[PDB]
Amino acid sequence: PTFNKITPNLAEFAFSLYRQLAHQSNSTNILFSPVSIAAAFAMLSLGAKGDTHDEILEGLNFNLTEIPEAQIHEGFQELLRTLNQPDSQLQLTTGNGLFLSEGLKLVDKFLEDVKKLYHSEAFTVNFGDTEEAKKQINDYVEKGTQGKIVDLVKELDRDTVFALVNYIFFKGKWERPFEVKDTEEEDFHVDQVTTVKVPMMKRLGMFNIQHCKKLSSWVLLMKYLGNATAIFFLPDEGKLQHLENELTHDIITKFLENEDRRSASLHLPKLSITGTYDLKSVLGQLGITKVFSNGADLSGVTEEAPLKLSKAVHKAVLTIDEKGTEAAGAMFLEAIPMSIPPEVKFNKPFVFLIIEQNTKAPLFMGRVVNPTQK
């Protein structure tokens, strides 16, 4: 359906972002969201029609030619249900939210045209006072954040018609339970002049790694204690640009269709990464330009005042650690130090992306380089 058409597209909109995203910085602990962004910025072309329905959609590798409104919006319609199903396996939650202003004449052409099944939440507080406006927006990303991060804005202007926010978050769980006590604090290397004291987890095992070639790296599909599809990517010798470079969907599709075991001493690192960014640097650079700016009717919610999209701003906060001990939280074989080409220590800057076995789209897409940078 979409897990053959719209998911690959989802693994691409995101990818057609990073291939521009590195031109910004370098040491940048990145983390962007392919899923919870498109499923927060594509829901707009639902109601928002005209030129936007193209621009804020086609850029995402789409082309309303051999792929019409159907299978696309129907994509997420499936994509939300057929991802979100009851299981003692995890949670990878997130939400949107549009806090408008009080005193207009709202309609529905684009607002109620975003209601459908994925009923939005359209409000109208007052943007006169920017003090309770920049808090009344920041705290929605507090209900879902529950404690994560909230400041998706701290500065608001009295020229903002209304904006859009999001709040993706996640607690880490996994099938391969690394030791909770056997954590050898070792050092981490960057380019050449560094010695970063990164937390170091470890446990040996016949783990899911089956080293690739046409990119130059050691993957590691460490499945999580349920349906989360983890994909890492450690290079060969401080040679980073290739494994992250050559990457159309088909690539890891092949890696994901395999059950290979390998005798080795795995050694990965403990950490947490807040990959927050304004949806602009690359959005209105890659393609998504108009809507938010002050040069094209982004009306549809009402029929009274020339509307735009103020500060569309997405979220992100991922954690790495040791959570999953429900009654049978075991590392069964913990006495076999078997190993052919082992000691896959993660004392090197890598890059990854965690898909989803249910829908199969890279919801969290980032890396981990210089820890200390904040």
Side-chain angles (χ1 to χ4, degrees), residues 169-254:
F169 85 149
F170 178 79
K171 82 166 280 73
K173 196 176 299 281
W174 47 41
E175 183 241 326
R176 289 336 296 159
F178 263 45
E179 228 83 50
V180 185
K181 288 66 198 174
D182 180 24
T183 356
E184 294 296 318
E185 223 269 24
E186 304 286 350
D187 268 15
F188 180 88
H189 309 136
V190 179
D191 203 278
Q192 282 176 75
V193 285
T194 358
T195 13
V196 174
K197 288 62 172 53
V198 166
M200 279 291 182
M201 24 172 209
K202 161 168 57 207
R203 178 207 197 265
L204 289 50
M206 281 90 75
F207 300 146
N208 197 316
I209 155 66
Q210 192 60 350
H211 185 290
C212 41
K213 195 198 302 165
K214 272 57 177 300
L215 12 68
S216 324
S217 305
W218 294 94
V219 196
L220 211 88
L221 289 174
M222 315 318 271
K223 315 293 182 174
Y224 299 164
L225 268 186
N227 279 331
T229 358
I231 304 185
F232 299 76
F233 237 170
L234 204 68
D236 258 47
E237 173 79 285
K239 300 183 295 87
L240 54 126
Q241 288 175 192
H242 193 38
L243 63 153
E244 118 238 325
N245 299 65
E246 186 51 77
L247 264 185
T248 296
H249 184 23
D250 56 291
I251 309 296
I252 310 176
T253 306
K254 306 309 202 162

Coordinates of all heavy atoms in Angstrom, one line a residue, residues 169-254:
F169 N 8.9 12.5 21.1 CA 9.7 12.0 22.2 C 9.8 10.5 22.3 O 9.2 9.8 21.5 CB 9.3 12.7 23.6 CG 8.2 12.0 24.4 CD1 8.2 12.1 25.8 CD2 7.2 11.3 23.7 CE1 7.3 11.5 26.5 CE2 6.3 10.6 24.5 CZ 6.3 10.7 25.9
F170 N 10.6 9.9 23.2 CA 10.8 8.4 23.2 C 11.7 7.9 24.4 O 12.7 8.5 24.7 CB 11.4 8.0 21.9 CG 11.6 6.5 21.8 CD1 10.6 5.6 21.5 CD2 12.9 6.0 21.9 CE1 10.9 4.2 21.4 CE2 13.2 4.6 21.8 CZ 12.1 3.8 21.5
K171 N 11.3 6.8 25.0 CA 12.1 6.2 26.0 C 12.7 5.0 25.3 O 12.0 4.3 24.5 CB 11.3 5.7 27.2 CG 10.6 4.3 27.0 CD 10.1 3.7 28.3 CE 11.2 3.1 29.2 NZ 12.0 4.1 29.8
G172 N 14.0 4.7 25.6 CA 14.7 3.6 25.0 C 14.5 2.2 25.6 O 14.7 2.0 26.8
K173 N 14.2 1.2 24.7 CA 14.0 -0.2 25.1 C 14.6 -1.0 24.0 O 14.7 -0.5 22.8 CB 12.5 -0.5 25.2 CG 12.1 -1.7 26.0 CD 10.6 -1.9 26.2 CE 10.0 -0.7 26.9 NZ 10.1 -0.8 28.4
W174 N 15.0 -2.2 24.3 CA 15.6 -3.1 23.3 C 15.6 -4.6 23.6 O 15.6 -4.9 24.7 CB 17.0 -2.6 23.0 CG 17.8 -2.3 24.2 CD1 17.9 -3.0 25.3 CD2 18.7 -1.2 24.3 NE1 18.8 -2.5 26.2 CE2 19.4 -1.4 25.6 CE3 19.1 -0.1 23.5 CZ2 20.4 -0.5 26.0 CZ3 20.1 0.7 23.9 CH2 20.7 0.5 25.2
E175 N 15.7 -5.4 22.5 CA 15.8 -6.9 22.6 C 17.1 -7.3 23.2 O 17.2 -8.3 23.9 CB 15.6 -7.5 21.2 CG 15.6 -9.1 21.4 CD 16.7 -9.8 20.6 OE1 17.1 -9.3 19.5 OE2 17.2 -10.8 21.0
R176 N 18.2 -6.7 22.7 CA 19.6 -7.0 23.2 C 19.9 -6.2 24.5 O 20.4 -5.1 24.4 CB 20.6 -6.9 22.1 CG 20.5 -7.9 21.0 CD 19.8 -9.2 21.6 NE 20.5 -10.0 22.6 CZ 19.9 -10.8 23.4 NH1 18.6 -11.0 23.4 NH2 20.6 -11.5 24.3
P177 N 19.6 -6.8 25.6 CA 19.9 -6.1 26.9 C 21.3 -6.1 27.2 O 21.9 -7.1 27.5 CB 19.1 -6.9 27.9 CG 19.3 -8.3 27.4 CD 19.0 -8.1 25.9
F178 N 21.9 -4.9 27.0 CA 23.3 -4.7 27.3 C 23.4 -4.8 28.9 O 22.4 -4.7 29.6 CB 23.9 -3.4 26.8 CG 24.6 -3.5 25.5 CD1 24.0 -4.3 24.5 CD2 25.8 -2.9 25.3 CE1 24.7 -4.5 23.2 CE2 26.5 -3.1 24.1 CZ 26.0 -3.9 23.1
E179 N 24.6 -5.1 29.4 CA 24.8 -5.2 30.8 C 24.3 -3.8 31.5 O 24.5 -2.8 30.9 CB 26.2 -5.5 31.2 CG 26.3 -6.7 32.3 CD 26.2 -8.1 31.6 OE1 26.9 -8.4 30.7 OE2 25.4 -8.9 32.1
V180 N 23.7 -3.9 32.7 CA 23.2 -2.8 33.4 C 24.3 -2.4 34.4 O 24.3 -1.3 35.0 CB 21.9 -3.1 34.1 CG1 21.4 -1.8 34.8 CG2 20.9 -3.7 33.1
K181 N 25.2 -3.3 34.7 CA 26.3 -3.1 35.7 C 27.7 -3.1 35.0 O 28.6 -2.4 35.5 CB 26.3 -4.2 36.8 CG 25.2 -4.2 37.7 CD 23.8 -4.4 37.1 CE 22.6 -4.0 37.9 NZ 21.3 -4.1 37.3
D182 N 27.8 -3.9 34.0 CA 29.1 -4.0 33.2 C 29.2 -2.9 32.2 O 29.0 -3.1 31.0 CB 29.2 -5.4 32.6 CG 30.5 -5.6 31.8 OD1 31.5 -4.9 32.0 OD2 30.5 -6.4 30.9
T183 N 29.5 -1.7 32.7 CA 29.6 -0.5 31.9 C 31.0 0.1 32.1 O 31.3 0.7 33.1 CB 28.6 0.5 32.2 OG1 27.7 0.0 33.2 CG2 27.7 0.9 31.0
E184 N 31.9 -0.2 31.1 CA 33.3 0.2 31.2 C 33.5 1.6 30.6 O 33.6 1.7 29.4 CB 34.2 -0.8 30.4 CG 34.3 -2.2 31.0 CD 35.0 -2.2 32.4 OE1 36.0 -1.5 32.6 OE2 34.5 -2.9 33.2
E185 N 33.7 2.6 31.4 CA 33.9 4.0 30.9 C 35.2 4.1 30.2 O 36.3 4.0 30.8 CB 33.8 5.0 32.1 CG 33.0 6.2 31.7 CD 33.8 7.4 31.1 OE1 34.9 7.1 30.6 OE2 33.3 8.5 31.2
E186 N 35.2 4.3 28.9 CA 36.3 4.4 28.1 C 36.3 5.7 27.4 O 35.5 6.6 27.7 CB 36.3 3.3 27.0 CG 36.1 1.8 27.6 CD 37.4 1.3 28.2 OE1 38.5 2.0 28.0 OE2 37.4 0.3 28.9
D187 N 37.3 6.0 26.5 CA 37.3 7.3 25.8 C 36.8 7.2 24.4 O 36.7 6.2 23.8 CB 38.7 7.9 25.8 CG 38.9 8.8 27.0 OD1 38.1 8.7 28.0 OD2 39.9 9.6 27.0
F188 N 36.4 8.4 23.9 CA 35.8 8.6 22.6 C 36.7 9.5 21.7 O 37.2 10.5 22.2 CB 34.4 9.2 22.8 CG 33.7 9.4 21.5 CD1 32.9 8.4 20.9 CD2 33.8 10.7 20.8 CE1 32.3 8.6 19.7 CE2 33.1 10.9 19.6 CZ 32.3 9.9 19.1
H189 N 36.8 9.2 20.4 CA 37.6 10.0 19.5 C 36.7 10.7 18.5 O 35.7 10.2 18.2 CB 38.6 9.1 18.7 CG 39.4 8.1 19.5 ND1 39.5 6.8 19.1 CD2 40.0 8.3 20.6 CE1 40.3 6.2 20.0 NE2 40.6 7.1 21.0
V190 N 37.1 11.9 18.1 CA 36.4 12.7 17.2 C 37.1 12.7 15.8 O 37.0 11.8 15.1 CB 36.2 14.2 17.7 CG1 35.4 15.0 16.7 CG2 35.5 14.2 19.0
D191 N 37.9 13.8 15.5 CA 38.7 13.8 14.3 C 40.1 13.4 14.6 O 40.4 12.2 14.5 CB 38.7 15.3 13.7 CG 38.9 15.3 12.2 OD1 40.1 15.2 11.8 OD2 38.0 15.5 11.4
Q192 N 40.9 14.3 15.2 CA 42.2 13.9 15.6 C 42.6 14.3 17.0 O 43.2 13.6 17.8 CB 43.2 14.4 14.6 CG 43.3 13.6 13.3 CD 44.3 14.2 12.3 OE1 45.5 14.1 12.5 NE2 43.7 14.8 11.3
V193 N 42.2 15.6 17.4 CA 42.6 16.1 18.7 C 41.5 16.1 19.8 O 41.2 17.1 20.3 CB 43.2 17.5 18.6 CG1 44.6 17.5 18.1 CG2 42.3 18.5 17.8
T194 N 41.1 14.9 20.2 CA 40.2 14.7 21.3 C 40.2 13.4 22.1 O 40.9 12.5 21.7 CB 38.7 14.9 20.7 OG1 38.8 15.2 19.3 CG2 38.0 16.1 21.4
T195 N 39.6 13.5 23.3 CA 39.6 12.3 24.2 C 38.3 12.4 25.1 O 38.4 12.4 26.4 CB 40.8 12.2 25.1 OG1 41.6 13.4 25.0 CG2 41.7 11.0 24.6
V196 N 37.1 12.4 24.5 CA 35.8 12.5 25.2 C 35.4 11.3 26.0 O 35.3 10.2 25.5 CB 34.7 12.8 24.2 CG1 33.3 12.8 24.9 CG2 34.9 14.3 23.6
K197 N 35.2 11.5 27.3 CA 34.8 10.5 28.3 C 33.3 10.1 28.2 O 32.5 10.6 29.0 CB 35.1 11.0 29.7 CG 36.7 11.0 30.0 CD 37.5 12.0 29.1 CE 38.9 12.1 29.6 NZ 39.6 10.8 29.8
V198 N 33.0 9.4 27.1 CA 31.6 9.0 26.9 C 31.3 7.7 27.7 O 32.1 6.9 28.0 CB 31.4 8.6 25.3 CG1 30.1 7.8 25.1 CG2 31.4 9.9 24.5
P199 N 30.0 7.6 28.2 CA 29.6 6.4 29.0 C 29.7 5.3 28.0 O 29.2 5.4 26.8 CB 28.2 6.8 29.4 CG 28.2 8.3 29.5 CD 29.0 8.7 28.3
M200 N 30.2 4.1 28.4 CA 30.3 2.9 27.6 C 29.6 1.7 28.1 O 30.0 1.0 29.0 CB 31.8 2.6 27.4 CG 32.5 3.4 26.4 SD 31.9 2.9 24.9 CE 32.8 3.9 23.7
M201 N 28.6 1.3 27.3 CA 27.9 0.1 27.7 C 28.6 -1.1 27.0 O 29.5 -0.8 26.1 CB 26.4 0.2 27.2 CG 26.1 1.3 26.1 SD 24.4 1.3 25.4 CE 24.7 1.9 23.8
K202 N 28.3 -2.3 27.3 CA 28.9 -3.5 26.7 C 28.2 -4.8 27.1 O 27.5 -4.9 28.1 CB 30.4 -3.6 26.9 CG 31.1 -5.0 26.7 CD 32.6 -5.0 26.6 CE 33.3 -4.5 27.9 NZ 34.6 -3.9 27.6
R203 N 28.5 -5.8 26.2 CA 28.0 -7.2 26.4 C 28.4 -7.8 25.0 O 28.2 -7.3 24.0 CB 26.5 -7.3 26.5 CG 26.0 -8.7 26.6 CD 24.6 -8.9 26.2 NE 24.0 -10.2 26.7 CZ 24.0 -11.3 26.0 NH1 24.5 -11.4 24.7 NH2 23.6 -12.5 26.6
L204 N 29.0 -9.0 25.1 CA 29.4 -9.7 23.9 C 28.2 -10.5 23.4 O 27.2 -10.6 24.1 CB 30.6 -10.6 24.2 CG 32.0 -10.1 24.5 CD1 32.0 -9.0 25.5 CD2 32.9 -11.2 24.9
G205 N 28.3 -11.1 22.2 CA 27.2 -11.9 21.8 C 27.2 -12.1 20.3 O 28.0 -11.5 19.5
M206 N 26.3 -13.0 19.8 CA 26.2 -13.3 18.4 C 25.1 -12.4 17.9 O 24.1 -12.8 17.4 CB 25.7 -14.8 18.2 CG 26.9 -15.8 18.4 SD 27.2 -16.5 20.0 CE 25.8 -17.6 20.1
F207 N 25.4 -11.1 18.0 CA 24.5 -10.0 17.6 C 24.3 -9.7 16.2 O 25.1 -10.0 15.3 CB 24.9 -8.7 18.4 CG 24.8 -8.9 19.9 CD1 25.7 -8.2 20.8 CD2 23.9 -9.8 20.5 CE1 25.6 -8.4 22.1 CE2 23.8 -9.9 21.8 CZ 24.7 -9.3 22.7
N208 N 23.2 -8.9 15.9 CA 22.9 -8.5 14.6 C 23.7 -7.4 13.9 O 23.4 -6.2 14.0 CB 21.4 -8.2 14.5 CG 20.9 -8.2 13.1 OD1 21.5 -7.7 12.2 ND2 19.7 -8.8 12.9
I209 N 24.7 -7.9 13.3 CA 25.7 -7.1 12.5 C 26.1 -8.1 11.4 O 26.2 -9.3 11.5 CB 27.0 -6.8 13.4 CG1 28.2 -6.5 12.6 CG2 27.3 -7.9 14.4 CD1 28.1 -5.3 11.7
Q210 N 26.2 -7.5 10.2 CA 26.6 -8.3 9.0 C 27.2 -7.3 8.0 O 26.6 -7.0 6.9 CB 25.4 -9.0 8.4 CG 25.8 -10.1 7.4 CD 26.7 -11.1 7.9 OE1 27.3 -11.0 9.0 NE2 27.0 -12.2 7.1
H211 N 28.3 -6.7 8.4 CA 29.1 -5.7 7.7 C 29.0 -5.5 6.2 O 29.4 -6.4 5.5 CB 30.6 -5.8 8.1 CG 31.4 -4.7 7.5 ND1 31.7 -4.6 6.2 CD2 32.2 -3.8 8.2 CE1 32.6 -3.7 6.0 NE2 32.9 -3.1 7.2
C212 N 28.5 -4.4 5.8 CA 28.3 -4.0 4.4 C 29.5 -3.6 3.6 O 30.7 -3.6 4.1 CB 27.1 -3.0 4.2 SG 27.0 -1.6 5.4
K213 N 29.4 -3.2 2.3 CA 30.5 -2.8 1.5 C 30.3 -1.5 0.8 O 31.0 -0.6 1.0 CB 30.7 -3.9 0.5 CG 32.0 -3.9 -0.3 CD 32.0 -4.7 -1.6 CE 31.7 -6.2 -1.3 NZ 31.3 -7.0 -2.4
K214 N 29.2 -1.4 -0.1 CA 28.9 -0.2 -0.9 C 28.6 1.1 -0.2 O 27.8 1.9 -0.7 CB 27.8 -0.6 -1.9 CG 28.3 -1.1 -3.3 CD 29.2 -2.4 -3.1 CE 29.6 -2.9 -4.5 NZ 28.4 -3.3 -5.4
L215 N 29.2 1.3 1.0 CA 29.0 2.4 1.8 C 30.2 2.5 2.8 O 30.6 3.6 3.2 CB 27.7 2.4 2.6 CG 26.9 1.1 2.5 CD1 27.7 0.0 3.3 CD2 25.5 1.2 3.1
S216 N 30.9 1.4 3.0 CA 32.1 1.2 3.9 C 31.9 1.2 5.4 O 32.7 1.7 6.1 CB 33.1 2.3 3.5 OG 33.1 2.6 2.1
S217 N 30.9 0.4 5.9 CA 30.7 0.4 7.3 C 30.1 -0.8 8.0 O 29.8 -1.8 7.3 CB 29.9 1.6 7.7 OG 30.5 2.8 7.3
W218 N 30.1 -0.8 9.3 CA 29.6 -1.9 10.2 C 28.2 -1.4 10.6 O 28.0 -0.4 11.4 CB 30.4 -2.0 11.5 CG 31.8 -2.4 11.4 CD1 32.9 -1.6 11.3 CD2 32.2 -3.8 11.3 NE1 34.0 -2.4 11.2 CE2 33.6 -3.7 11.2 CE3 31.6 -5.0 11.4 CZ2 34.4 -4.9 11.1 CZ3 32.4 -6.2 11.3 CH2 33.7 -6.1 11.2
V219 N 27.1 -2.1 10.1 CA 25.7 -1.7 10.5 C 25.6 -2.2 12.0 O 26.5 -2.0 12.8 CB 24.6 -2.3 9.5 CG1 23.3 -1.5 9.7 CG2 25.1 -2.1 8.0
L220 N 24.4 -2.8 12.3 CA 24.1 -3.3 13.6 C 22.5 -3.2 13.8 O 22.1 -2.2 14.5 CB 24.8 -2.5 14.7 CG 25.2 -3.1 16.0 CD1 26.6 -3.7 15.9 CD2 25.2 -2.0 17.1
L221 N 21.7 -4.1 13.3 CA 20.3 -3.9 13.4 C 19.8 -4.5 14.8 O 19.0 -5.6 14.8 CB 19.5 -4.5 12.2 CG 19.5 -3.7 10.9 CD1 18.8 -4.4 9.8 CD2 18.9 -2.4 11.1
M222 N 20.2 -3.9 15.9 CA 19.8 -4.3 17.2 C 18.3 -4.0 17.4 O 17.9 -2.9 17.8 CB 20.7 -3.6 18.3 CG 22.1 -3.5 17.9 SD 22.7 -5.1 17.3 CE 23.2 -5.9 18.7
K223 N 17.5 -5.0 17.2 CA 16.1 -4.9 17.3 C 15.7 -4.6 18.8 O 16.4 -5.0 19.7 CB 15.4 -6.2 16.9 CG 15.9 -6.8 15.5 CD 15.6 -5.9 14.3 CE 16.1 -6.6 13.0 NZ 15.7 -5.8 11.8
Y224 N 14.7 -3.7 18.9 CA 14.3 -3.3 20.3 C 13.3 -4.3 20.8 O 12.7 -5.1 20.0 CB 13.8 -1.8 20.2 CG 14.9 -0.8 19.8 CD1 14.6 0.5 19.4 CD2 16.2 -1.2 19.8 CE1 15.6 1.3 19.0 CE2 17.2 -0.4 19.3 CZ 16.9 0.9 18.9 OH 17.9 1.7 18.5
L225 N 13.0 -4.3 22.1 CA 12.1 -5.3 22.7 C 10.6 -5.2 22.3 O 9.7 -5.2 23.1 CB 12.2 -5.3 24.2 CG 13.1 -6.3 25.0 CD1 13.0 -6.2 26.5 CD2 13.0 -7.7 24.5
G226 N 10.5 -5.3 21.0 CA 9.2 -5.2 20.3 C 9.3 -5.0 18.9 O 10.1 -5.7 18.2
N227 N 8.7 -3.9 18.4 CA 8.7 -3.5 16.9 C 9.6 -2.4 16.4 O 9.4 -2.0 15.3 CB 7.3 -3.3 16.4 CG 6.6 -4.6 16.1 OD1 7.2 -5.6 15.8 ND2 5.3 -4.5 16.3
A228 N 10.5 -1.9 17.2 CA 11.4 -0.8 16.8 C 12.5 -1.3 16.0 O 13.3 -2.2 16.4 CB 11.9 0.0 17.9
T229 N 12.7 -0.8 14.8 CA 13.8 -1.2 13.9 C 15.1 -0.3 13.9 O 15.2 0.7 13.1 CB 13.3 -1.4 12.5 OG1 11.9 -1.1 12.4 CG2 13.6 -2.8 12.0
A230 N 16.0 -0.6 14.8 CA 17.3 0.2 14.9 C 18.3 0.0 13.8 O 18.6 -1.2 13.5 CB 17.9 -0.1 16.2
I231 N 18.8 1.1 13.4 CA 19.9 1.0 12.4 C 20.9 2.0 12.8 O 20.6 3.2 13.1 CB 19.3 1.5 11.0 CG1 18.1 0.7 10.6 CG2 20.4 1.3 9.9 CD1 17.6 1.0 9.2
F232 N 22.2 1.5 13.0 CA 23.3 2.3 13.4 C 24.1 2.5 12.1 O 23.6 2.4 11.0 CB 24.1 1.6 14.5 CG 23.4 1.3 15.7 CD1 22.4 0.3 15.8 CD2 23.6 2.1 16.9 CE1 21.7 0.1 17.0 CE2 22.9 1.8 18.1 CZ 22.0 0.8 18.1
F233 N 25.4 2.7 12.3 CA 26.4 2.8 11.1 C 27.7 3.3 11.5 O 28.0 4.5 11.4 CB 25.7 3.7 10.1 CG 25.6 3.1 8.7 CD1 24.9 3.7 7.7 CD2 26.2 1.8 8.5 CE1 24.8 3.1 6.4 CE2 26.2 1.2 7.2 CZ 25.4 1.9 6.2
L234 N 28.6 2.4 12.0 CA 30.0 2.8 12.3 C 30.9 2.6 11.1 O 30.8 1.6 10.4 CB 30.5 2.0 13.5 CG 31.6 2.6 14.4 CD1 31.1 3.8 15.2 CD2 32.2 1.6 15.4
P235 N 31.7 3.6 10.7 CA 32.6 3.6 9.5 C 33.6 2.5 9.5 O 33.4 1.4 10.0 CB 33.2 5.0 9.5 CG 32.3 5.8 10.3 CD 31.9 4.9 11.4
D236 N 34.8 2.8 8.9 CA 35.9 1.9 8.8 C 37.1 2.4 9.5 O 37.7 1.8 10.4 CB 36.2 1.4 7.4 CG 35.7 0.0 7.1 OD1 34.5 -0.3 7.4 OD2 36.4 -0.9 6.5
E237 N 37.6 3.6 9.1 CA 38.7 4.2 9.7 C 38.5 5.7 9.6 O 39.0 6.4 8.6 CB 40.0 3.8 9.0 CG 41.3 4.6 9.5 CD 41.9 4.1 10.8 OE1 41.3 4.4 11.9 OE2 43.0 3.4 10.8
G238 N 37.8 6.3 10.5 CA 37.5 7.7 10.5 C 37.1 8.3 9.2 O 37.3 9.4 8.9
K239 N 36.6 7.3 8.3 CA 36.1 7.7 7.0 C 34.5 7.7 7.1 O 33.9 6.6 6.9 CB 36.5 6.6 6.0 CG 38.0 6.4 5.8 CD 38.3 5.4 4.8 CE 37.9 4.0 5.1 NZ 36.5 3.7 4.7
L240 N 34.0 8.9 7.3 CA 32.5 9.1 7.5 C 31.6 9.3 6.3 O 30.5 8.8 6.2 CB 32.3 10.2 8.5 CG 33.0 11.5 8.1 CD1 32.0 12.6 8.1 CD2 34.2 11.8 9.1
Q241 N 32.1 10.1 5.4 CA 31.3 10.4 4.2 C 31.2 9.4 3.1 O 32.0 9.5 2.2 CB 31.6 11.9 3.7 CG 31.0 12.9 4.7 CD 31.4 14.3 4.3 OE1 31.2 15.2 5.1 NE2 31.8 14.6 3.1
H242 N 30.3 8.5 3.2 CA 30.0 7.5 2.2 C 28.8 6.6 2.7 O 27.9 6.4 1.9 CB 31.3 6.6 2.0 CG 31.2 5.8 0.7 ND1 30.6 6.2 -0.4 CD2 31.6 4.5 0.5 CE1 30.6 5.2 -1.3 NE2 31.2 4.2 -0.8
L243 N 28.9 6.1 3.9 CA 27.9 5.3 4.5 C 26.6 6.1 4.7 O 25.5 5.5 4.6 CB 28.4 4.7 5.9 CG 28.7 5.6 7.0 CD1 28.4 4.9 8.4 CD2 30.1 6.2 6.9
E244 N 26.8 7.4 5.0 CA 25.6 8.2 5.1 C 25.3 8.9 3.8 O 24.2 9.4 3.6 CB 25.9 9.3 6.2 CG 25.9 10.8 5.8 CD 27.2 11.5 6.1 OE1 27.9 11.2 7.1 OE2 27.6 12.3 5.2
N245 N 26.3 8.8 2.9 CA 26.2 9.4 1.6 C 25.3 8.6 0.6 O 24.3 9.1 0.1 CB 27.5 9.7 1.0 CG 28.3 10.7 1.8 OD1 28.7 10.4 3.0 ND2 28.6 11.9 1.3
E246 N 25.8 7.5 0.3 CA 25.1 6.6 -0.6 C 24.0 6.0 0.2 O 24.3 5.2 1.1 CB 26.1 5.5 -1.2 CG 25.5 4.6 -2.2 CD 24.9 5.5 -3.4 OE1 25.6 6.0 -4.2 OE2 23.6 5.6 -3.4
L247 N 22.8 6.4 -0.1 CA 21.6 5.8 0.7 C 20.2 6.1 0.1 O 19.6 7.1 0.5 CB 21.7 6.3 2.1 CG 22.3 5.3 3.2 CD1 22.1 5.9 4.6 CD2 21.6 4.0 3.1
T248 N 19.8 5.3 -0.9 CA 18.4 5.5 -1.4 C 17.7 4.4 -0.5 O 18.4 3.6 0.1 CB 18.3 5.2 -2.9 OG1 19.0 6.1 -3.7 CG2 16.8 5.3 -3.3
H249 N 16.4 4.5 -0.4 CA 15.8 3.5 0.5 C 16.2 2.1 0.3 O 16.8 1.5 1.2 CB 14.2 3.5 0.4 CG 13.6 2.6 1.3 ND1 14.2 2.1 2.5 CD2 12.3 2.0 1.3 CE1 13.4 1.3 3.1 NE2 12.3 1.2 2.4
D250 N 16.0 1.5 -1.0 CA 16.4 0.2 -1.3 C 17.6 -0.4 -0.5 O 17.6 -1.6 -0.1 CB 16.7 0.0 -2.8 CG 17.7 1.0 -3.3 OD1 17.5 2.2 -3.3 OD2 18.8 0.5 -3.7
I251 N 18.6 0.4 -0.2 CA 19.8 0.0 0.5 C 19.5 -0.8 1.7 O 19.6 -2.1 1.7 CB 20.7 1.3 0.9 CG1 20.9 2.2 -0.3 CG2 22.0 0.8 1.5 CD1 21.7 1.5 -1.5
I252 N 19.1 -0.2 2.8 CA 18.9 -0.9 4.1 C 17.6 -1.8 4.0 O 17.4 -2.6 4.9 CB 18.8 0.0 5.3 CG1 20.0 1.0 5.3 CG2 18.8 -0.7 6.6 CD1 20.0 2.0 6.4
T253 N 16.9 -1.7 2.9 CA 15.7 -2.5 2.8 C 16.2 -3.9 2.7 O 15.6 -4.8 3.3 CB 15.0 -2.2 1.4 OG1 14.7 -0.8 1.2 CG2 13.7 -3.0 1.3
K254 N 17.3 -4.1 2.1 CA 18.0 -5.4 1.9 C 18.6 -5.9 3.2 O 18.7 -7.1 3.5 CB 19.1 -5.2 0.9 CG 18.6 -4.6 -0.5 CD 17.4 -5.4 -1.0 CE 17.1 -5.2 -2.4 NZ 16.3 -6.4 -2.9

